[PDB]
RNA sequence: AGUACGAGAGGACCGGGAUGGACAUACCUCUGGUGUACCAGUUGUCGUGCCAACGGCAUAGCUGGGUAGCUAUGUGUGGACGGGAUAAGUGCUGAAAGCAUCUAAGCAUGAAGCCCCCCUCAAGAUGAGAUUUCCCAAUUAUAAGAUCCCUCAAAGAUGAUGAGGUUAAUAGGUUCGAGGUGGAAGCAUGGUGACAUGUGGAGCUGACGAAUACUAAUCGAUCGAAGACUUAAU
RNA sequence: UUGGCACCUCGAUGUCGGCUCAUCGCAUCCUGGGGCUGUAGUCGGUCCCAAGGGUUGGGCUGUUCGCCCAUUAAAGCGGUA
């Protein structure tokens, strides 16, 4: 198994579930904790459970385990992690508050 | 089941497969022999009487326990042995097996089994009431004369006696304790050693008693 | 270790700088807390201009200690000060940007949002 | 070892240094049992420096042996330090340790204390 | 440790003869392998040697570093399999054998 | 902390059963001067 | 396991673990605390008309560290499940009075509670038990067998328990190792100098380990059994 | 519990809280069984069986008690000069 052969599938169920600015970052020459990140955001409190409840299955297709869904019920910022891919499900505006992309502005990024 | 006797030697550690540390004691177990198989028709219980360490033979001006005596010597050679120092009976073990005069090898213990250990404690002399039973000590400033002492003992002119199961000073130490459900790590055969995960009672050079667990 | 009437510090961009511990969230008469532990605090010193003023009770999380943690591989890690980070109802941080390292034990502690943001994990 | 003898450190370190010296001069003394099971050791570690005889041992054969006692044997004068490396060392050049010998006399009158002799061999 | 030699014999095939030498105050690097999944990477720790005790399998040391203002320390066993290698790259002079004046 | 009664003549003497002394050894008279 | 059930959302039964808080017990391999006969550093003043290499007292003269040993804030187990029945409460045949009905002749059911299962002490249990082997007379000596007495701790207020007594490795010492300190003295190069380098991971080392009869466990004394009687079977 | 009576004790029965220790009782605060209902589900409410074990740290005034922030499966009422 390998990561780069597993991120075109990672952008899959989040454009299926109609994610927006669904970009992806890498951390090869950055960090030693996780390879690549994926990012998104969503509008409605209803709309934020289905984006990531899907990812539960899609990790069971390759049969990699999931360990936590933080703020899932609260439905504000949610994080399913895999040590190679991460699904940061955001809100319409909290994306701007934390502003992920510019902390790691020095990130080779790719749009999808 | 199965049971072997031996001496506690020391304590060290080993590295597992995942580099994890596992702490271990080191049990030596040589020269065990069976000396009397039992019966229900005679005693009322089946068992296996076993003896562990060798000693010397009868002597005329004999003034130790190194050199054996005649009643002992008349019990070793019966089952074709030498005089044995320590003796114990094991009662929870199958008796159709274990013929007489043989030896008992550590090899009957695999690595990864489960056991329970039984031995003596260490000696503390005449000790108080808060090292022993472990209970609160009193103030040391603000004008106080109660520091390390057992406060009260009774109530009043009702129940003017003092009940029996009461906590006072005295002696704690060489009592019989057991430990349940430890693990077998590794089993040498030449040096005749068995290793156990965890620490077990007694002092060094003491005596240890090993047996299979009964629980699930 | 972190117990009642203990003064940690703060390592986030949320105004509160120093705090005072007054509880630990176990419950059977618990009397300490190490890394990975949700607690209750107040503030005793802030910065002018921010989002968490002085006199506000809040819950908070450890990230560093003088006493370390006993890794199962037979390894130990002890820092040279203490530190804390302030959180919210949604199990996530008040501010945004983390300062100073943290400890890897926070990955299996559902604090992945904070390793998601911090310079040096170690 | 490890005996205190009802005498605190600063006192015991000076009582065991007088015993080691006055013994050597007369080779035979009369003490209680306990003390002579402790100069059983201090003085046996003190000939083992006298067989070397080097310049360094004389420097550690003075940090326990006692101040220069101007002896007077037959028409002479010595020091307890130019008697220990010249004379005892030469008698005892071919044995191993064990050159002391304890001997039990009776008790005393006043305090009821076992009395023993100690000499060299 | 020749007591009766039964403990320093069993614990013989858990040693390793791969590791260079080092006294206190001798900078060196430490290539751990860290397992957080099906397979994971290395993540060096670098620093300066302050402590070393013991003998046998239970022989330890520790190293100090500063990292973005804060100090940190990690102490390791010498014979564990995690530690791929050790790389001593500098050497010094001191008069102590436990170093704590570094805080 | 103070005696409430008198001690009889018996209880005084039932108590001194063990309040005696002992004998030396006997080597041929010669002392056991090991 | 979103299945029984729930108007759907919600939600068990089932039964699987994973990780914990308080509490109770053994231990010292790790992390750490002490360590007053161990190792370096360092000020003041007395002792050698001084060189400082040494000692004494000044909280152990102060400071940095620390072996054996006892310790927790450290290191590992434990709580039981499982069964025998019993409260309320669920029932079935079944009479009462046809039918009825859980109690009346009957009879399954079912609570962390109760006795049994797990750990510890126990035959002065005068109801004083059960095996195994060893010892056997001319009041009377003495046998198996123990105690006095001397060397010591894995034990210990004192008694007692335990290891060993010259066919002997018990404690000490001597010769080798470990762990700890952190590079002696003394000569030799370099610096005007106080200093730093090299000969040399040096030298010293209390309590832990081994080997070795050089010292002493000498000498010698004292207690100590000789199977009753019927009434049966032999 | 506030009391009534004045039977022992005045040639001495010599003291309200809190600290240290513990011990019994249920008319049960939590856990454990169940019945009942408007308990659809949850959440309860009500009465029934049950004492094996369990039952928190701190601020103000003397504080016995009282009020208040903060946690907890729960933060029990009475006896024993
Ligand atoms: K208080
Ligand atoms: Mg006073
Ligand atoms: Mg005598
Ligand atoms: Mg003076
Ligand atoms: Mg009244
Ligand atoms: Mg009244
Ligand atoms: Mg009247």
């Amino acid at each position: 198994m390998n990561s780069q052969e597993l991120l075109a599938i990672a952008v899959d169920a989040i454009d299926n579930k109609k994610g927006e600015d669904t970009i992806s970052l890498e951390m090869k020459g950055i960090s030693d904790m996780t390879d690549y990140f994926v990012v998104t955001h969503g509008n409605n409190e209803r709309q934020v459970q289905a984006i990531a409840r899907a990812v539960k299955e899609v990790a069971n297709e390759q049969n990699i385990e999931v360990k936590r869904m933080e703020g899932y019920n609260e439905a504000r910022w949610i994080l399913i992690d895999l040590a190679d891919v991460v699904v940061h499900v955001f809100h319409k505006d909290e994306r701007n508050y934390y502003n992920i992309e510019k902390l790691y502005q020095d990130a080779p990024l790719e749009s999808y | 089941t199965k049971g072997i006797l031996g001496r506690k030697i020391g304590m060290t550690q080993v590295f597992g497969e995942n580099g994890e540390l596992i702490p271990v004691t080191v049990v030596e177990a040589k020269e065990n022999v069976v000396l009397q198989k039992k019966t229900v028709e005679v005693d009322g219980y089946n068992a296996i009487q076993v003896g562990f360490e060798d000693k010397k033979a009868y002597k005329k001006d004999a003034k130790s326990n190194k050199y054996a005596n005649k009643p002992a010597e008349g019990h070793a050679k019966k089952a074709d042995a030498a005089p044995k120092r320590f003796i114990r009976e094991f009662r929870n073990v199958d008796v159709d097996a274990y013929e007489v005069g043989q030896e008992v090898s550590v090899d009957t213990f695999v690595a990864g089994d489960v056991i329970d250990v039984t031995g003596v404690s260490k000696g503390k002399g005449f000790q108080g009431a808060i090292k022993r039973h472990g209970q609160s000590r009193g103030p040391m400033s603000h004008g106080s004369h109660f520091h390390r002492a057992p406060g009260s003992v009774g109530m009043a002119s009702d129940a003017s006696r003092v009940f029996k199961g009461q906590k006072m000073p005295g002696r704690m130490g060489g009592n019989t304790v057991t430990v349940q459900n430890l693990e077998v790590v590794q089993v040498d055969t030449e040096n005749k050693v068995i290793l156990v995960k965890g620490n077990v009672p007694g002092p060094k050079k003491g005596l240890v008693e090993i047996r299979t667990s009964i629980k699930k | 270790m972190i117990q009642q009437e203990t003064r940690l510090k703060v390592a986030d961009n949320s105004g509160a700088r120093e705090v005072l511990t007054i509880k630990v969230l176990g419950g059977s008469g618990r009397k300490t807390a190490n890394i990975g532990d949700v607690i209750v605090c107040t503030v005793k010193n802030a910065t002018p201009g921010g989002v968490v003023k002085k006199g506000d009770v809040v819950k908070a999380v450890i990230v560093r200690t003088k006493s370390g943690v006993r890794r199962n591989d037979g390894s130990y890690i002890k820092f040279d000060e203490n530190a804390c980070v302030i959180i919210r109802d949604d199990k996530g941080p008040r501010g945004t940007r983390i300062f100073g390292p943290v400890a890897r034990e926070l990955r299996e502690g559902n604090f992945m949002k904070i390793v998601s943001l911090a310079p040096e994990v170690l | 070892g490890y005996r205190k003898l009802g005498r605190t450190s600063d006192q015991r370190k000076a009582m065991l240094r007088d015993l080691a010296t006055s013994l050597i001069i007369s080779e035979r003394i009369e003490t209680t049992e306990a003390r002579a099971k402790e100069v059983r050791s201090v003085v046996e570690k003190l000939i083992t420096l006298g067989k070397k005889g080097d310049l360094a041992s004389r420097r550690n054969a003075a940090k326990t042996l006692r101040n220069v006692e101007i002896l007077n044997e037959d028409e002479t004068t010595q020091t307890a330090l130019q008697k220990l490396f010249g004379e005892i060392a030469e008698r005892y050049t071919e044995r191993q340790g064990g050159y002391t010998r304890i001997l039990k006399q009776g008790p005393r009158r006043g305090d009821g204390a076992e009395s023993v002799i100690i000499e060299l061999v | 440790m020749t007591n009766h030699k039964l403990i320093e014999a069993v614990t013989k095939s858990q040693l390793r003869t791969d590791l260079p030498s080092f006294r206190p105050g001798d900078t060196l690097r430490v290539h751990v392998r860290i397992i957080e999944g099906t397979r994971e990477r290395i993540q060096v720790f670098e620093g300066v040697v302050i402590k070393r005790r013991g003998g046998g399998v239970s022989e330890t040391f520790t190293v100090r570093k500063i990292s973005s203002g804060v100090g940190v320390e990690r102490t390791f066993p010498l014979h564990t399999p995690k530690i791929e290698k050790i790389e001593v790259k500098r050497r010094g002079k001191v008069r102590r054998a436990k170093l704590y004046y570094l805080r | 902390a103070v005696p409430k009664r008198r001690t009889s003549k018996t209880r005084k003497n039932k108590r001194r059963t063990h309040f005696k002394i002992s004998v030396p050894g006997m080597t041929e008279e010669y002392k056991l001067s090991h």
Side-chain angles (χ1 to χ4, degrees), chain B residues 77-148:
Chain B
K77 67 174 75 169
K78 178 69 179 294
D80 288 331
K84 300 296 178 184
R85 185 177 185 94
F86 291 105
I87 316 292
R88 295 294 184 275
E89 300 187 355
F90 296 2
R91 190 177 176 183
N92 51 10
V93 62
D94 196 357
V95 291
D96 293 330
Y98 288 116
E99 288 76 1
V100 176
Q102 71 180 358
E103 297 84 5
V104 183
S105 65
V106 306
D107 296 329
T108 184
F109 289 112
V110 303
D113 204 358
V114 69
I115 62 175
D116 57 354
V117 173
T118 302
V120 68
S121 295
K122 288 164 76 82
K124 278 76 179 169
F126 196 96
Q127 283 296 329
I130 63 165
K131 184 176 241 76
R132 180 167 173 180
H133 295 291
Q135 68 194 8
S136 301
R137 60 115 187 74
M140 294 298 288
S141 175
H142 297 91
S144 74
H145 296 93
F146 181 70
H147 306 292
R148 304 171 66 94

